[PDB]
């Protein structure tokens, strides 16, 4: 196999001064989670946390699979100068028995490319352990 | 694997200028086995506008599995016209008579290009 990839869309709306993070789908989860009787969630964090609005989001948990479809958007009330300098950390995290959290891989993503003009960027990102 | 090409796209709106930076080519050996020949990149802004320049070529460099072209192309075009265009990049081989036969390429959408000017760097697979 290859690496585990995750597909995400990014769009910034300056009228309403908010940022959209759409977690679309995960691919090749087997590269990170070999035994798959667990449920995984995508953990999303806008770093630095910023000491005002929610910086930590988490998808619903789904039964592991090598083609896993979350259609969860998260909105964050931010302005472009702040946003433009931030980092997006995403991790595929599972939970073992007794709701413990363990994260199997992730990626930090520069937002310097996010478009102030509001165009959507849709890319695949590799999650490394 | 597959021959990949890394490209960055930035749009200047004060001026009406579009920048296409051909950055590098990875796993060229997936398309060109005999790497003794020389290689260049062909780039076309489609639909090719008459009364405008649309086709471009990089300098020809000796075939490497990892080959860095560091070569920008500038186009005079506006965002409305840019927004419905498509980019055709092919990896081609040329000899000294400048006979060009192309080994593969890809069609790239410019719907993500930022009008605000933010650069967009990405890899693309070149297909046979």
Swiss-Prot record, chain B:
Entry's localization field:
Cytoplasm, Perinuclear region; Nucleus; Cell projection, Ruffle membrane; Cytoplasm, Cytosol
Inducers of expression: Strongly up-regulated by progestin treatment.
**Superkingdom to which the source organism belongs:** Eukaryota
Q: Where is the C2 domain?
A: 1-124
Reported tissue expression: Expressed in mammary epithelial cells and breast cancer cell lines. Found in the luminal epithelium surrounding the ducts in the normal breast. In the brain, expressed in somatodendritic compartment of neurons in the cortex and hippocampus and in the cerebellum it is found in the Purkinje cells and some granule cells (at protein level). Detected in brain, heart, colon and kidney. In the kidney, expressed in glomerular podocytes, in some tubules and in the collecting duct.
Its quaternary organisation is: Homodimer. Forms heterodimers with WWC2 and WWC3. Interacts with DDN. Interacts with DYNLL1 and histone H3. The interaction with DYNLL1 is mandatory for the recruitment and transactivation functions of ESR1 or DYNLL1 to the target chromatin and the interaction with histone H3 ensures proper regulatory interaction of WWC1-DYNLL1-ESR1 complexes with target chromatin. Interacts (via WW domains) with DDR1 (via PPxY motif) in a collagen-regulated manner. Interacts with PRKCZ (via the protein kinase domain).
Protein family according to the UniProt entry: Belongs to the WWC family. KIBRA subfamily.
Q: What is known of its domains?
A: The C2-domain mediates homodimerization. It is a calcium-sensitive lipid-binding domain with preference for PI(3)P.
What is the role of this chain? Regulator of the Hippo signaling pathway, also known as the Salvador-Warts-Hippo (SWH) pathway. Enhances phosphorylation of LATS1 and YAP1 and negatively regulates cell proliferation and organ growth due to a suppression of the transcriptional activity of YAP1, the major effector of the Hippo pathway. Along with NF2 can synergistically induce the phosphorylation of LATS1 and LATS2 and function in the regulation of Hippo signaling pathway. Acts as a transcriptional coactivator of ESR1 which plays an essential role in DYNLL1-mediated ESR1 transactivation.
Protein name (Swiss-Prot/TrEMBL)? Protein KIBRA
Organism encoding this protein: Homo sapiens (Human)
Origin organism lineage: Eukaryota, Metazoa, Chordata, Craniata, Vertebrata
Report the gene name.
WWC1
């Amino acid at each position: 196999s290859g690496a585990t990839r995750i597909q995400i869309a990014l769009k910034y709306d300056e009228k309403n001064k908010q940022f959209a993070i759409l977690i679309i789908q995960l691919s090749n989860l087997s590269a990170l989670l070999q035994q798959q009787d667990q449920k995984v969630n995508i953990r999303v964090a806008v770093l630095p946390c910023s000491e005002s609005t929610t910086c930590l989001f988490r998808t619903r948990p789904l039964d592991a699979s090598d083609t896993l479809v979350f259609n969860e958007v998260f909105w964050v009330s931010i302005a472009y100068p702040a946003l433009h300098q931030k980092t997006l950390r995403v991790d595929v995290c599972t939970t073992d028995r007794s709701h413990l959290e363990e994260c199997l891989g992730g990626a930090q993503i520069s937002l310097a490319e996010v478009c102030r003009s509001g165009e959507r960027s849709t890319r695949w990102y590799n999650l490394l352990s």
